[PDB]
Nucleic acid binder design. Structure first.
Ligand SMILES: [Ca+2]
Ligand SMILES: [Ca+2]
Lengths: 77, 77, 77, 74
DNA sequence: CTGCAGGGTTTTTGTACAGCCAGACAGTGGAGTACTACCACTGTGTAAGACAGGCCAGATC
DNA sequence: GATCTGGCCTGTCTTACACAGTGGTAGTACTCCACTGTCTGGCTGTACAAAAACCCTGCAG
């Protein structure tokens, strides 16, 4: 169990990004003139994702291997 | 004194000038002729007696360190 | 289907390369059209390199493009 | 070859089922890798146990519609 | 208990003489100052193509 | 029966080419120097009313 990784509770990452784009969704409800006490439920967000890795990344002060080479960054938008 | 890039400084500059900005920092361009007062080769002077074997021309600044190495290949490189 | 898949994902055509096989195909088309490949159905490596070189000199002559070893995006464009 | 089948194959079916192509490519991530590198260059905490934690923190900051919106640039 | 309406009651709100000065509108002649894309240069990652050598089929030992 | 050699694949290396950056430069376009008058709107000494939400109080239920 040496493989080092970091990530998020996916759902929480979502609720973050959504609470961000809150401003835009509200202004967009304002342009479309759609009511608010009636647009509380029927929402649908489409999620894109992607995953690739970078080869053998270069770094400084690593004359020996500190596994500072490979990285695969899984993401969404 | 903080090791910032010129790209860096210009970006920060535009940005902060947007925010409440009465233009605060100075635009990058003005530094490039603001150091002409700090770098070498700007303040006239002289000596008595005149300096031996050293050209009496002063306004020059940075100079390549070879001092006219005759570029002839076959000779000392 | 030989190995149990694990990650539901609707794939799509890569929008990035999307051209590179097309590029190498048009390249082979030109290389074999300077040759009469359906008049001599099976040529060896000599006329291959020959057609390549004459085609690349032709492209450098008229459109001003160097020959290359691998096809990136901009070369294909 | 592969790409030729793919292109002459299904493009209409995809743009019908989906509505675009370039709007789903992974090109984006290939750019974002640059970001990764630079962050590791200039914000690692010097310990792989802490490295990715820091990198992720800074990147997630860098990708918030909030903060880019504070990048008016007029 | 409740709802409703004349007035209270204090607060808030606009209209009201009356003179003063900050702040803006035009434009002039183009400087000029801020901005935006070359630009010379190599370091770093990348992935197409060599290729070799290992392996199966052809045919053999 | 047991082994040789082309035909073909792919795993590995390698090599051109792309981005990535950065300080310098050139090309461009958007901000004022100063002259001069001149109009507009928000400040200053008390007085009169107009609205407004809670509070008492009458009187109705
Ligand atoms: Ca990849
Ligand atoms: Ca990649």
């Amino acid at each position: 169990a040496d493989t080092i990784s970091r990530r998020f509770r996916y759902d929480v990452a979502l609720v973050s990004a959504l609470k961000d784009l809150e401003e835009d969704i509200m202004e967009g409800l304002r342009e479309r003139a759609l009511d608010d006490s009636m647009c509380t439920s029927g929402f649908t967000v489409v999620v894109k994702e992607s995953c690739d890795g970078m080869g053998d990344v270069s770094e400084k002060h690593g004359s020996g291997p500190a596994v500072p080479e490979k990285a695969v960054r899984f993401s969404f938008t | 004194n903080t090791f910032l890039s010129c790209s860096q400084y210009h970006k920060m500059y535009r940005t902060v000038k947007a925010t409440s900005g009465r233009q605060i920092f100075q635009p990058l361009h003005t530094l490039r002729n603001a150091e002409k007062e700090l770098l070498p080769g700007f303040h006239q002077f002289e000596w008595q007696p005149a300096l031996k074997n050293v050209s009496t021309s002063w306004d020059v600044g940075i100079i390549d360190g070879l001092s006219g190495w005759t570029v002839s290949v076959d000779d000392v490189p | 289907v030989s190995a149990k898949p694990f990650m539901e994902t609707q794939p799509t055509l890569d929008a990035l390369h999307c051209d590179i096989g097309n590029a190498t195909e048009f390249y082979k088309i030109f290389q074999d059209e300077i040759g009469e490949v359906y008049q001599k159905p099976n040529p060896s490596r000599e006329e291959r390199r020959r057609w390549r070189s004459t085609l690349d000199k032709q492209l450098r002559k008229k459109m001003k493009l160097k020959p290359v070893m691998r096809m990136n995006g901009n070369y294909a464009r | 070859t592969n790409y030729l089948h793919k292109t002459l194959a299904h493009v209409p079916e995809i743009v019908e089922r989906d509505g675009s192509i370039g709007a789903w490519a992974s090109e984006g991530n290939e750019s974002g890798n640059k970001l990764f590198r630079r962050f590791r260059k200039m914000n690692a905490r010097q310990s792989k146990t802490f490295e990715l934690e820091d990198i992720l923190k800074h990147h997630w900051l860098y990708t918030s519609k909030y903060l880019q919106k504070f990048m008016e640039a007029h």
